[PDB]
Design a protein around this ligand. Structure first.
Ligand SMILES: OC[C@H]1O[C@H](O[C@H]2[C@H](O)[C@@H](O)[C@@H](O[C@H]3[C@H](O)[C@@H](O)[C@@H](O)O[C@@H]3CO)O[C@@H]2CO)[C@H](O)[C@@H](O)[C@@H]1O
Length: 393
């Protein structure tokens, strides 16, 4: 079905405040007569380039900024040309995240970083270092609890530890990323992943732990800490756990270095509703009332809109988000990013389960993080996984 003129269809991930975004859509329809339909399909960031290539899909797509360079390189995004006054309503660093080859390719919404979230009743003094976590888990285990649970299935969550002692994605030099210099298999990456693998070998974490499992355990008071972003705070508030949000633990004396994402809204190049989409984003969403609706549903983090960011800034959870962001690094947005993420996901999963050694896992990741994907999902490049041998212990 080609995109319908005279309507807006919006895709946003299921962990964000889509019901709040729908309220903004209701206001848009009231004021303009144009219906807005908000959807949260699974794997939307993989599905988008497939449907958009055929002239179909949403008018507006929301994701962290890292996926957008790939979309832009494929010609799937409309150029964004806000006037300089509008640009001035948002922090200039947020616009920098949505630039690709000299053009703006999306509207920035909010800056996201992972923090350490901890249960103040179980653990009034959170650990400053990763190194002290094994001993903390041993102590808490004897008490019927555990130290730490977080999603080990998505590399976003383990990256801060991999990067802490020197892991990196692509070297940046002279204003551009060098896709022939990948840093997932240097001494620092090896050290970080080895520490994670050892936490698992020593039974302080389980390799199968995922987002739902870690969320449930924290929100039910079973584990003292988790690692998550601002979107997760809503469900924690509902649980009534007495929690803090703080700086991530250091590793080998170095700060954990999360990859920072800017939630961004791009416009489908095939949309016959480009001007309506721009009106929705500039005049309705990127306003105090618009972001309030979304943020009240699931917190956005450090919002791009200066006026609303100022209202929220006193929140120590946002302060902690910004503290972790500044110790981290903006995600590249280059087309090669998806290949990087698939490669690192497989490395962490294989190393964590004992399917491969850390050195074997990261050696493979270095090879394939660089490899060029012709598709949004890297399906053929991921066939490399047939080479991996089961442990068979
Ligand atoms: O691991 C497989 C996965 O890799 C890529 O996903 C990455 C995202 O592109 C990246 O933005 C980040 O995603 C996190 C969001 O930024 C955050 O808002 C929240 O939604 O959590 C996400 C992590 O689950 O990190 C992931 C990598 O973990 C790739 O684009 C995906 O297609 C692929 O499934």
């Amino acid at each position: 079905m080609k995109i319908e003129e005279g309507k807006l269809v919006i895709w946003i991930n299921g962990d964000k405040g889509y019901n709040g975004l729908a309220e903004v859509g209701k206001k848009f329809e009231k004021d303009t007569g144009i219906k807005v339909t908000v959807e949260h399909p699974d794997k939307l960031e993989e599905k988008f380039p497939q449907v958009a290539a055929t002239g179909d899909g949403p008018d507006i797509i929301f994701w962290a900024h890292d996926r957008f360079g790939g979309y832009a390189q494929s010609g799937l995004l409309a150029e964004i040309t806000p006037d300089k006054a509008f640009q001035d309503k948002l922090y200039p660093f947020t616009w920098d995240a949505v630039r690709y080859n000299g053009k703006l390719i999306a509207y920035p919404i909010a800056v996201e970083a992972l923090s350490l979230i901890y249960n103040k009743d179980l653990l009034p003094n959170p650990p400053k270092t990763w190194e002290e976590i094994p001993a903390l888990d041993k102590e808490l285990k004897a008490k019927g609890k555990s130290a730490l649970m977080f999603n080990l299935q998505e590399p976003y969550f383990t990256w801060p530890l991999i990067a802490a002692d020197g892991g990196y994605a692509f070297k940046y030099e002279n204003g551009k990323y060098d896709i022939k210099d990948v840093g997932v298999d240097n001494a620092g990456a090896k050290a970080g992943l080895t520490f994670l693998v050892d936490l698992i070998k020593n039974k302080h974490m389980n390799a199968d732990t995922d987002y739902s499992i870690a969320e449930a355990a924290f929100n039910k008071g079973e584990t003292a800490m988790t690692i998550n972003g601002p979107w997760a705070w809503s469900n924690i508030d509902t649980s009534k756990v007495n929690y803090g949000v703080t700086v991530l633990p250091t590793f080998k004396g170095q700060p954990s270095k999360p990859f920072v994402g800017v939630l961004s809204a791009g416009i489908n190049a095939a949309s016959p509703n480009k001007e309506l989409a721009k009106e929705f984003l500039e005049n309705y969403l990127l306003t105090d009332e618009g972001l309030e609706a979304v943020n009240k549903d699931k917190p956005l983090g450090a919002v791009a809109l200066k006026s609303y960011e100022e209202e929220l800034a006193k929140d120590p959870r946002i302060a902690a988000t910004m503290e972790n962001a500044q110790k981290g690094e903006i995600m590249p947005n280059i087309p090669q990013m998806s290949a990087f993420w698939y490669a690192v996901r497989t490395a962490v999963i294989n190393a964590a389960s004992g399917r491969q050694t850390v050195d074997a896992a990261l050696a493979a990741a270095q090879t394939n993080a660089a490899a060029k994907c012709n598709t949004a999902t890297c399906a053929t490049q991921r066939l490399a996984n047939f080479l991996v041998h089961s442990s068979n212990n």
